[PDB]
């Protein structure tokens, strides 16, 4: 009751996983359930090591709010999507009460907030467009995106599906959404490769990660369009169960980290760029 | 029962203008404010209020905070503490909801409940064009003397900010002698060179540098912060007010208010 099952997911620099006996300096223990084969429910927890901005937030939360935890990595999906009205991902781990809370680059939107409770946002984010070459594109709302085939030839751009970004483009821009799907990227790394090689003209994704990526890009050729503009501004948050007793102390603790300078320190520790 | 809405004068979020002769005034609402008199409120937060009102189907009455303050907690003198400003009105019952550029912090959140942020912004510094300083770390700011004078708004979140850290104490003791009653007055005192630097919300300050082209910001946010709707610790409306704010970020409404008012 003071010991909490917490779920997380890897996405640098917020959560970074390293192979391990004991987890060394500034990392914490996080287990990941790895199956024996693809034709069995059988599996085994592999002991690994977690670090990063959100891991540091977690330590700090644990210190101040006074709980212990067992941290594990999500296996059934990623951040969280509702599929046939059933939540997968970190969101579903909380929703089906496997985890007391979820920590990581977890974007707050309306639909997730219907089924879990979220802390105050502690990282600004939204939706940004990253390019690799010069462009005149305004933002997500540019005609090149909304009505792509108005142009011959059209722009080729995509996201990583099944997260808060795709869920947003699907609600707001139906035509853009069905045009984009053929350019779905399997991950941020993949997209960046496509951008640099020119098989992708633009990559539409979470602003905080995009800003980070551009921050650590060698040659500094990757930028976010429009002065790093952010459509649909929101934040990462700690997802807790609906009606959680923990939300209050977690919130005040977070807001205290802000007054402490503790957040700014985390920010410079992990999010310092070279560009 | 109707909702009592307190707000505060703060362009471009709440414009305050006098009703014309008939008692009548872009969506505009009748609001009463300092003994009280009918007046015309409009702007960003008003548009938001009207969006929440229609969305969640409620009626409201708007008035301006009596002491013209955002709100901090001061010692009564002794022993008791009390909240002034919009914060005090909400806690007392004179308001049911604060709709305003109300900054979220640990101190206020201890007592009230904020919606999710309808506006992400931060703190920056306003100056008159001829002035140049690096930022919040310039020698003239961190090592104050009445030869270079800067202020913030009294009983504001920025006030709380500087009083909170022992390490910010000398800055705070310098600001204490120069702090203004309203941001409007402080912005005015910067144009007249009566004030050298105004430390305040970037959302507000960059809108003024945007139109009063004799003022500029330096530079540069030095602190992130956000605005949310104030409600008391109960509250039935609290969960659905957040969902609405999230919805409006997501579907473009908040982005539109930006472009209509900033
Ligand atoms: C990239 C990075 N973005 C942010 C980073 C560190 N976190 C902060 O600076 C911060 C600031 N303010 C708050 C609390 N109030 S909030 O109104 O809801 C708000 C406002 C602006 C924000 F940016 C934000 F996250 C949240 C919190 C919890 N954290 S790194
Ligand atoms: N941060 C996102 C993941 C990436 C995205 O789709 O923008 C989420 O929690 O869904």
Curated annotation (Swiss-Prot), chain A:
The UniProt annotation places L-glutamate binding at 105, 107, 112, 164-165, 206
UniProt-annotated glycosylation sites, renumbered to this chain: 37-38, 162
Q: Where in the cell is it found?
A: Cell projection, Dendritic spine; Cell membrane; Synapse; Postsynaptic cell membrane
Topological region Extracellular: 136-275
Q: List the disulfide bonds.
A: 23-49, 30-50, 220-275
The record's tissue-specificity note reads: Detected in brain cortex, olfactory bulb, hippocampus including the dentate gyrus, striatum, thalamus, superior colliculus, inferior colliculus, midbrain and cerebellum (at protein level). Detected in brain cortex, hypothalamus and cerebellum.
Domain of life the protein comes from? Eukaryota
Domains (record comment): Contains an N-terminal domain, a ligand-binding domain and a transmembrane domain. Agonist binding to the extracellular ligand-binding domains triggers channel gating.
Subunit composition and interactions: Heterotetramer. Forms heterotetrameric channels composed of two GluN1/zeta subunits (GRIN1), and two identical GluN2/epsilon subunits (GRIN2A, GRIN2B, GRIN2C or GRIN2D) or GluN3 subunits (GRIN3A or GRIN3B) (in vitro). Can also form heterotetrameric channels that contain at least two GluN1 subunits and at least two different GluN2 subunits (or a combination of one GluN2 and one GluN3 subunits) (in vitro). In vivo, the subunit composition may depend on the expression levels of the different subunits. Found in a complex with GRIN1, GRIN3A and PPP2CB. Found in a complex with GRIN1 and GRIN3B.
Family to which this protein belongs: Belongs to the glutamate-gated ion channel (TC 1.A.10.1) family. NR2A/GRIN2A subfamily.
Q: What does this protein do?
A: Component of N-methyl-D-aspartate (NMDA) receptors (NMDARs) that function as heterotetrameric, ligand-gated cation channels with high calcium permeability and voltage-dependent block by Mg(2+). NMDARs participate in synaptic plasticity for learning and memory formation by contributing to the slow phase of excitatory postsynaptic current, long-term synaptic potentiation, and learning.
Q: What is this protein called?
A: Glutamate receptor ionotropic, NMDA 2A
Portion of the full-length sequence here = 403 to 800 of 1464
Swiss-Prot record, chain B:
The residue spans the entry assigns to the Extracellular side of the membrane are as follows: 132-262
Q: Which residues are glycosylated?
A: 57, 77, 143, 240
Free-text tissue specificity from the UniProt record: Detected throughout the brain, in brain cortex, cerebellum, thalamus and olfactory bulb.
- Record PTM: NMDA is probably regulated by C-terminal phosphorylation of an isoform of NR1 by PKC. Its phosphorylated state is influenced by the formation of the NMDAR-PPP2CB complex and the NMDAR channel activity.
Specify the superkingdom. Eukaryota
* Compartments reported by the entry: Cell membrane; Postsynaptic cell membrane; Synaptic cell membrane; Postsynaptic density membrane
Q: Which cysteines are joined by disulfide bonds?
A: 25-40, 31-41
Positions bound to glycine:
101, 103, 108, 157, 201
Quaternary state and interactors: Heterotetramer; the NMDAR subunits are modular and harbor tiered domains that function in concert to regulate opening and closing of the cation-selective ion channel pore. Forms heterotetrameric channels composed of two GluN1/zeta subunits (GRIN1), and two identical GluN2/epsilon subunits (GRIN2A, GRIN2B, GRIN2C or GRIN2D) or GluN3 subunits (GRIN3A or GRIN3B) (in vitro). Can also form heterotetrameric channels that contain at least two GluN1 subunits and at least two different GluN2 subunits (or a combination of one GluN2 and one GluN3 subunits) (in vitro).
Fill in the domain comment. Answer: A hydrophobic region that gives rise to the prediction of a transmembrane span does not cross the membrane, but is part of a discontinuously helical region that dips into the membrane and is probably part of the pore and of the selectivity filter. The extracellular N-terminal domain (ATD) is a site of allosteric regulation to modulate overall receptor function.
Per the record, the similarity remark reads: Belongs to the glutamate-gated ion channel (TC 1.A.10.1) family. NR1/GRIN1 subfamily.
User: What the protein does?
Assistant: Component of N-methyl-D-aspartate (NMDA) receptors (NMDARs) that function as heterotetrameric, ligand-gated cation channels with high calcium permeability and voltage-dependent block by Mg(2+). NMDARs participate in synaptic plasticity for learning and memory formation by contributing to the long-term potentiation (LTP). Channel activation requires binding of the neurotransmitter L-glutamate to the GluN2 subunit, glycine or D-serine binding to the GluN1 subunit, plus membrane depolarization to eliminate channel inhibition by Mg(2+).
Protein name as catalogued: Glutamate receptor ionotropic, NMDA 1
Q: Which residues of the full protein are shown?
A: 396 to 793 of 938
């Amino acid at each position: 009751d003071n010991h909490l099952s917490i779920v997380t997911l890897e996405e640098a620099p917020f959560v970074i996983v390293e192979d391990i006996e004991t987890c060394v300096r500034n990392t914490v223990p996080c287990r990941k359930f790895v199956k024996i084969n693809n034709s069995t429910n059988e599996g085994m927890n592999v002991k690994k090591c977690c670090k990063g901005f959100c891991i540091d937030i977690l330590k700090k939360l644990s210190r101040t709010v006074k709980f212990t935890y067992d941290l594990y990595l999500v296996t059934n999906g990623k951040h969280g999507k509702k599929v046939n009205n059933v939540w997968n991902g970190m969101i579903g781990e909380v929703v089906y009460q496997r985890a007391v809370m979820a920590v990581g680059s977890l974007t707050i939107n309306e639909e997730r907030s219907e089924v879990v409770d979220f802390s105050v946002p502690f990282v600004e984010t939204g939706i940004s467009v990253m390019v690799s070459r010069g462009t005149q594109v305004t933002g997500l709302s540019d005609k090149k995106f909304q009505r792509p085939h108005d142009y011959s030839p059209p722009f080729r751009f995509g996201t990583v599906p099944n997260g808060s970004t795709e869920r947003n483009i699907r609600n707001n821009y139906p035509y853009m959404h069905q045009y984009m799907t053929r350019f779905n990227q399997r991950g941020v790394e993949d997209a960046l490769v496509s951008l640099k090689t020119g098989k992708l003209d633009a990559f539409i994704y979470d602003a905080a990660v995009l800003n980070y990526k551009a921050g650590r890009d060698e040659g500094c050729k990757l930028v976010t369009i429009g002065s790093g503009y952010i459509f649909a501004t929101t934040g990462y948050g700690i997802a807790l169960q609906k009606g959680s007793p923990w939300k209050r102390q977690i919130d005040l603790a977070l807001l205290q980290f802000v007054g402490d300078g503790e957040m700014e320190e985390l920010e410079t520790l992990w999010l310092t760029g070279i560009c | 029962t109707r909702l009592k809405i307190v707000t505060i004068h703060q362009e471009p979020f709440v414009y305050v203008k006098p009703t014309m002769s008939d008692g009548t005034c872009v969506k505009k609402v009748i609001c009463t404010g300092p003994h009280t008199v009918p007046q015309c409120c409009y702007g960003f937060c008003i548009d938001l209020l009207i969006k929440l009102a229609r969305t969640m189907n409620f009626t409201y009455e708007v008035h301006l905070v009596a002491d013209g303050k955002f709100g901090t907690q001061e010692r009564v003198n002794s022993n008791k503490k009390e909240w002034n400003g919009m914060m005090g009105e909400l806690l007392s019952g004179q308001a049911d909801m604060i709709v305003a550029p109300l900054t979220i912090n640990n101190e206020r959140a201890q007592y009230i409940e904020f919606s999710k942020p309808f506006k992400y912004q931060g703190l920056t510094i306003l100056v008159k064009k001829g002035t140049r300083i690096t930022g919040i770390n310039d020698p003239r700011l961190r090592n104050p003397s009445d030869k270079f004078i800067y202020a913030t708004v009294k009983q504001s979140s920025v006030d709380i900010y500087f009083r909170r850290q022992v390490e910010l104490s000398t800055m705070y003791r310098h600001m204490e002698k120069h702090n203004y009653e309203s941001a409007a007055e402080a912005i005015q005192a910067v144009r007249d060179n009566k004030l050298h630097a105004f430390i305040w919300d970037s959302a507000v300050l960059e809108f003024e540098a945007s139109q009063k082209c004799d003022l500029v910001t330096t530079g540069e946010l030095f602190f992130r912060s956000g605005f949310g709707i104030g409600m008391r610790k109960d509250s039935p409306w609290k969960q659905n007010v957040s969902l609405s704010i999230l919805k409006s970020h997501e579907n473009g409404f908040m982005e539109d208010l930006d472009k209509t008012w900033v």
